[PDB]
Amino acid sequence: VSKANVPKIDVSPLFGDDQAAKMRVAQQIDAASRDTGFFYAVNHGINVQRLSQKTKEFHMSITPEEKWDLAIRAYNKEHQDQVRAGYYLSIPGKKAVESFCYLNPNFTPDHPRIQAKTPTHEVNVWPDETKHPGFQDFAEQYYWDVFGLSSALLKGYALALGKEENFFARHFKPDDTLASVVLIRYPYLDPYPEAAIKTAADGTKLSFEWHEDVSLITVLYQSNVQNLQVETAAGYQDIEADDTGYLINCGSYMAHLTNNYYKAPIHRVKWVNAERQSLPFFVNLGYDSVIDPFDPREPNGKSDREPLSYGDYLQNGLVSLINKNGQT
Ligand SMILES: CC(C)[C@@H](NC(=O)[C@H](CS)NC(=O)CCC[C@H](N)C(=O)O)C(=O)O
Ligand SMILES: [Fe+3]
C-alpha cells in the first residue's frame, strides 16, 4: 500500500491582504484538488490542543443515562426531532464508534427555519452543564473558530478556480449555515468485536467503507493515529496523520458545481485498534443556497449542469450515506 501525496499548505495568507500571496496558496489548493484531493492546512490559527483535550473526556465522562437523554432518533424513538444533532451511541460487541453531532448554535426556537420546521435544521441538545462544565462553551466557540478557518479556505478554493474570493464564502453565513461538527471517539477494545470490522473488496479491514463526503468541503482534525485512505486509479493510498494540521478535501457539492474538475475524493477509514479522535467540520451552505455550475476546463467556462439547492442536496446526501454505509 502506497502513500498519498498530501501537501502541507500554509494557509495563513488567506487571512490577510497580500493578494499575490493568496494566489500562491490558491495554486497549491488547485494542485492538491486535481491530484489526490486532500491537503493539510497548516499555520491555521486554531488551538487544536486540547480541542483534543476534550473533546475523549467529554467523551470519557458521559454516562449511559446521559447518552440516552441526548440520543438521536435512530437510538431513541422519543426524540423524533433529532435526526442530525445529538449523541450516536456505540453498541458494545457490534459497533465501536460513538459520536456527538451539533449544528449552527444560531438555530434556536426563534430562528425562522426552526419555526418553519425546515428539514436539516435542528436545535442543538447539550448535556447538563454541571456534569460537563465548560463543554457547551468550548463546543460553540470551536464551531465559530473552525467556521472562520473554513471561510478563509473557501476564499482559496474560489481563487483556485478563477473566481473572486467570495464566490463560495458569500453563501457561508453564521445566520443560516447547515455546517456540522462531529466529535467522534474510536475506542481501543480488547477483544475488538469482529462484528464492528468490515472487510473491503481488497481485503483491508475497515471501520467505515468508501464514500464521497456530503459537503462543499470537509475540514478535519484527527488525533495522531493513521487511519484514512484515499482511492486513486492505482488503488487506495494511506493518508498520513498530522495532529497539528487540518485535513481538507472537497465534497460532492463541489464536484457537482465544478463539472467534476475538483472531484470529491473517495476515501475510507481503516480499522485500527487504538483510542483516537476524529473531529470533522462539514462545510455546508444555507438551505436555499444555489451555486451556478461552471466548467473551468472549457474555454467559455459553461456547464449544462443544473444549479442545486444546497438544502435538498444535503437531505438527499445524508440519507443516502446512511443507507450505503450504515447508521453511525
Ligand atoms: C473521517 C471522518 C470525517 C469521520 N467520518 C465521518 O464523519 C462520516 C464520513 S465523511 N460522515 C458522516 O457519517 C456524515 C455525518 C453528518 C452529520 N451527522 C450531519 O448531520 O451533518 C470518521 O472518522 O469516520
Ligand atoms: Fe468522509
**Cα–Cα distance between 52 and 279 in angstroms, integer?**
9
Q: What single DSSP character describes residue 306? A: P
Q: What single DSSP character describes residue 106? A: T
Cα(213) to ligand 2 centroid in Å equals 5
| Measured torsion, CA atoms of residues 61, 65, 69, 73, in degrees rounded to the nearest 10 | 100
Instruction: Assign 9 to helix, strand or coil.
Output: strand
Locate 247 and state its grid cell: 485535513
- State which ligand 1 atom lies nearest to the alpha carbon of 85: 20
* Cα angle: 206, vertex 207, 210; to 5 degrees: 65
- Candidates 266, 144, 276; CA nearest to 210 is 266
Asked if the peptide bond before residue 191 counts as cis, ω within 30 degrees of 0, the response is: yes
Parallel, antiparallel, or unpaired for β 267-270 and 205-211? antiparallel
Q: Taking phi first (over 0 means left), then psi (-120 to 50 degrees means alpha), and beta for anything else, what does residue 10 get?
A: beta
**Cα–Cα distance between 135 and 199 in angstroms, integer?**
36
The per-residue b/e assignment along 42-71, b for 16 or more CB within 10 angstroms, e otherwise, is eebeeebeebbebbbebbeebeeeebebbb
Phi, psi of 245 (to 5 degrees): -110, 170
- Candidates 223, 257, 190; CA nearest to 57 is 223
Contact 99, 84 (CB under 8 A): no
Positive or negative, the CA dihedral 99, 105, 107, 109 is: positive
**Cα–Cα distance between 293 and 98 in angstroms, integer?**
36
- Candidates 12, 32, 36; CA nearest to 22 is 12
Ligand 1 pocket residue status of 180, Cβ below 6 Å = yes
Residue nearest to atom 8 of ligand 1 (CA): 213
Instruction: Assign 275 to helix, strand or coil.
Output: coil
**Cα–Cα distance between 254 and 33 in angstroms, integer?**
11
CA distances for 130 relative to 60, 101, 156, 166, 167, angstroms: 15, 20, 41, 41, 43
Contact 207, 98 (CB under 8 A): no
Instruction: Assign 180 to helix, strand or coil.
Output: strand
The residue ranges of every structural domain in the chain are 1-328
Q: What single DSSP character describes residue 319? A: H
- Candidates 204, 216, 327; CA nearest to 272 is 204
Ligand 1 pocket residue status of 230, Cβ below 6 Å = no
**Cα–Cα distance between 239 and 110 in angstroms, integer?**
42
Task: Give me the half-sphere count of Cα atoms (radius 13 Å) on the Cβ side of residue 208.
Answer: 22
The answer to whether 180 is annotated as binding is yes
Alpha helices in the chain (DSSP H): 19-34, 52-58, 64-70, 112-115, 135-160, 252-257, 310-325
Parallel, antiparallel, or unpaired for β 38-42 and 8-10? parallel
Place of cell 494557509: 11
The ligand that comes nearest to the alpha carbon of residue 277 is 1
Contact 248, 38 (CB under 8 A): yes
CA distances for 264 relative to 111, 162, 257, 287, 316, angstroms: 32, 19, 11, 21, 16
- Candidates 327, 239, 172; CA nearest to 35 is 239
Cα(18) to ligand 2 centroid in Å equals 32
Amino acid letter, residue 283? V
Locate 328 and state its grid cell: 453511525
Ligand 1 pocket residue status of 184, Cβ below 6 Å = yes
State CA 318 to chain mean position distance: 12
Q: Any residues with CB less than 8 A from the CB of 204 and at least 6 apart, and which?
A: 229, 236, 268, 270
**Cα–Cα distance between 187 and 305 in angstroms, integer?**
43
CA distances for 200 relative to 127, 134, 207, 268, angstroms: 37, 40, 10, 10
Contact 328, 88 (CB under 8 A): yes
The answer to whether 238 is annotated as binding is no
**Cα–Cα distance between 92 and 35 in angstroms, integer?**
39
Contact 8, 40 (CB under 8 A): yes
Cα(182) to ligand 1 centroid in Å equals 7
Contact 156, 250 (CB under 8 A): no
282 pairs with which residues across the strands?
A: 180, 218
**Cα–Cα distance between 51 and 55 in angstroms, integer?**
6
Locate 155 and state its grid cell: 476564499
Q: Specify the DSSP element, H or E, that contains 198.
A: strand 198-199
Place of cell 477494545: 189
**Cα–Cα distance between 167 and 124 in angstroms, integer?**
29
- Indicate which technique resolved this structure: X-ray
**Cα–Cα distance between 316 and 321 in angstroms, integer?**
9
